[PDB]
DNA sequence: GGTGTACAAGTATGAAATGTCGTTT
DNA sequence: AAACGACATTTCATACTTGTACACCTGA
DNA sequence: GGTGTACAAGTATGAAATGTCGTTT
DNA sequence: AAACGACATTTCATACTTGTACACCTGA
DNA sequence: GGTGTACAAGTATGAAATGTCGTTT
DNA sequence: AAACGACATTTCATACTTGTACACCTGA
């Protein structure tokens, strides 16, 4: 028995044994039997031997017509970036299925989109713009990073209920866990530091609030344990969100009445605060799948953590800006990846 | 020139032409070069087709031996279903990579889970297991769907904002989305039904309320209509308990009808055919739909139940049987 | 920020598959 | 000459390992 | 409850690869 | 006989097109 | 929804324009 | 009719609570 391959590859072989072409056959047919190819296809062979060939592979035979060029569907992407296959079978007259493959026949993977902290309008980013443009202006002068200090407020509740993802055999169910509780036991903590380390932290009462006083009250409280923690800070810049709290016509003038470098920082741009992007956000994560039993357990984890974190944390945190500015600015003002 | 591959091929002409090894051999050298097995091979080659073992392929040769078992890994799997592979690992000191892969070998993807409603404290169960158990039993003596109404209600944000999913080159952005604002205009429709399709509902003025007094006066109206528009009709409302809605004020507005109070358990609005099953299905349809103006929200709503098909309203009040069969086999946790 | 997966490219396993050689036929 | 009967010495789909690449998450 | 992606199977291109056959040497 | 022009006859990777299968959404 | 200022718009409260009196030419 | 001082009694410029609006967090 032979095949279809291995069997030009015989010829090769007479070939070189000088055997004729139509001589090979002759041995060829006789040498396994007749159910074999041609001596028309032999002579052929030989042919295509004589030039100096062999058969790396059979040549590229006929196909059908592509049914569409294949950029001419990269066009659709250039144009919405984000449709469905079904969206672009039709725009291609076509199937989806038939999409599918084009998609993975070019490099084409799909990613979803990141979430948005906030429509910005022209008149905000052109604000944030500035802002940086400015800030980033005099870290280039000299850094100021090295006595500026800033803290905001997020919540923290008291489960923190991940979705859990699965390892199994197909059509078998993943594992199901318990939706949130909009409404349960969570505390506010709000907290301020710089890049040394943290500084200073209250960690509110079970649906506590922050009113204007409030906040004021808890500088003062700030203050005290700064400059006891702080030697060298014995200005200081400090940097907190324009929210309606902090932006208050007393504390404007606690603050003034202080003396602090009131540092700007833009509308909605919670990138654009270390305590919010950097801070909150490590915490985010080792913050998740953690359930608390009680409000003194909360603080009590947030000790330990705030603590284990080397010094070297914070310091990166804070000597971000730059960049971040760099960025928001290069960005137009619009946030960035 | 000549492989390894099309020289066993070469040694299968010359067996079948009576040729000899060491002829067949010499033959090799003159017809290519010197650059051509040992004939020693060629001999063991001979041997392999006095058996006939046309070799059509080679043989698996040597391989270290596997690490970790194969149902090794895969029963820890049957402990905690969802490990992360850094984790498989570390417990079968093997490195991740190596890990990610005998999971690829065996037939095995991950999927994330289901979420769902709340943990049905092992007493809550009990409530549902029966709620079904007794409901599922009235429906063996009679099918009493033919003639069941409820309703729940649901709100509807003007903006429905979809993180968007996008094709494009291995990293890269992807079109985002910008965050829904959580407090922000919203209405709060509430709607009633039957087997035969949508019977009366009302849609509270954005940040609208709804008080036992409220409720009443909703219910109140619902009959009318009802009325005018179910002719036949005992009557049973299947409503869930609401605070609103086991208030003694109302438990009374109801029983000044007649009218059924089915049982329902807490926490299971996945016996609610009014959400499980009507509102499901108009959460895709408000997919990342804009309402400019409260009265746009009622328009499309009118739409909405009009372009539904009568069938489609069937359905969701035939599923409640087999949803209840679940129910209880399931012994109260939710079931999937 | 902090993980989690899966490609890419090295490092061994180890029994073929081949080779070398002295020895039977 | 033509095989053999022993060990050496190449071979090469395996199992694993580092090394990355990179979707995505996390703060809003 | 609804939809979006990709693994199956079929199925018509259509030119390279291969056949059949009467010339040519 | 050996091989070549000439007009028929296969092949086989393609490009799509129905069928599904099934993760994941939605309702909470 | 939570918390603030800036401003429009219904109210208490204090200060001019008036009204009622009693008294003398 | 005349023209005061004294107390009422209405009027009206003006110092309080109220009640909306838009703003910035947030997103439970
Ligand atoms: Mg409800």
Same mark, same amino acid.
């Given at each position: 028995?032979?095949? #279809?391959? !291995?069997?030009?590859?015989?010829?090769?072989?007479?070939?070189?044994?000088?055997?004729?072409?139509?001589?090979?056959?002759?041995?060829?047919?006789?040498?396994?039997?007749?159910?074999?190819? *041609?001596?028309?296809?032999?002579?052929?062979?030989?042919?295509?031997?004589?030039?100096?060939?062999?058969? =790396?592979?059979?040549?590229?035979?006929?196909?059908?017509?592509?049914?569409?060029?294949?950029?001419?569907?990269?066009?659709?992407?250039?144009?919405?970036?984000?449709?469905? !296959?079904?969206?672009?079978?039709?725009?291609?007259?076509?199937?989806?299925?038939?999409?599918?493959?084009? @998609?993975?026949?070019?490099?084409?993977?799909?990613?979803?989109?990141?979430? =948005?902290?906030?429509?910005?309008?022209?008149?905000?980013?052109?604000?944030? #713009?500035?802002?940086?443009?400015? @800030?980033?202006?005099?870290?280039?002068?000299?850094?100021?990073?090295?006595?500026?200090? *800033?803290?905001?407020?997020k919540w923290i509740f008291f489960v923190n209920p991940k979705?859990?993802?699965?390892? =199994?055999?197909?059509?078998?169910?993943?594992?199901?866990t318990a939706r949130p509780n909009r409404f349960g036991k969570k505390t506010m903590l709000?907290?301020?530091?710089?890049?040394?380390?943290?500084?200073?932290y209250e960690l509110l009462k079970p649906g506590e *609030?922050?009113?204007?006083?409030?906040?004021? !009250?808890? @500088?003062?409280?700030?203050?005290?344990?700064?400059?006891?923690?702080?030697?060298?800070?014995?200005?200081?810049?400090?940097?907190?969100?324009?929210?309606?709290?902090?932006?208050?016509?007393?504390?404007?003038?606690?603050?003034?009445?202080?003396?602090?470098? =009131?540092?700007?920082?833009?509308?909605?741009?919670?990138?654009?605060?270390?305590?919010?992007?950097?801070?909150?956000?490590?915490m985010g994560?080792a913050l998740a799948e953690q359930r608390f039993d009680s409000y003194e357990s909360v603080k009590k984890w947030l000790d330990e953590w705030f603590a284990?974190?080397?010094?070297?944390?914070?310091?990166?945190?804070?000597?971000?800006?730059?960049?971040?500015?760099?960025?928001?600015?290069?960005?137009?003002?619009?946030?960035?990846?």
């Amino acid at each position: 028995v032979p095949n #279809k391959e !291995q069997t030009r590859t015989v010829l090769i072989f007479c070939f070189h044994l000088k055997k004729t072409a139509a001589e090979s056959h002759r041995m060829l047919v006789e040498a396994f039997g007749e159910q074999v190819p *041609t001596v028309k296809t032999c002579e052929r062979w030989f042919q295509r031997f004589k030039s100096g060939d062999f058969d =790396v592979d059979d040549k590229e035979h006929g196909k059908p017509p592509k049914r569409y060029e294949d950029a001419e569907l990269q066009a659709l992407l250039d144009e919405d970036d984000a449709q469905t !296959q079904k969206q672009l079978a039709e725009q291609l007259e076509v199937s989806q299925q038939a999409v599918s493959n084009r @998609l993975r026949e070019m490099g084409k993977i799909q990613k979803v989109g990141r979430w =948005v902290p906030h429509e910005l309008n022209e008149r905000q980013m052109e604000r944030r #713009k500035n802002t940086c443009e400015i @800030l980033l202006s005099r870290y280039k002068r000299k850094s100021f990073l090295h006595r500026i200090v *800033t803290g905001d407020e997020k919540w923290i509740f008291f489960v923190n209920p991940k979705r859990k993802k699965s390892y =199994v055999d197909p059509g078998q169910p993943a594992t199901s866990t318990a939706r949130p509780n909009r409404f349960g036991k969570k505390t506010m903590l709000c907290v301020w530091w710089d890049q040394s380390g943290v500084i200073y932290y209250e960690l509110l009462k079970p649906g506590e *609030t922050v009113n204007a006083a409030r906040y004021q !009250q808890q @500088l003062i409280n700030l203050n005290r344990a700064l400059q006891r923690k702080r030697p060298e800070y014995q200005r200081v810049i400090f940097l907190h969100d324009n929210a309606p709290s902090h932006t208050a016509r007393a504390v404007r003038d606690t603050l003034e009445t202080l003396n602090w470098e =009131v540092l700007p920082h833009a509308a909605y741009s919670p990138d654009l605060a270390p305590s919010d992007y950097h801070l909150f956000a490590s915490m985010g994560h080792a913050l998740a799948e953690q359930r608390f039993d009680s409000y003194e357990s909360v603080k009590k984890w947030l000790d330990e953590w705030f603590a284990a974190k080397d010094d070297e944390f914070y310091w990166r945190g804070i000597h971000k800006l730059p960049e971040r500015w760099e960025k928001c600015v290069a960005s137009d003002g619009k946030y960035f990846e």
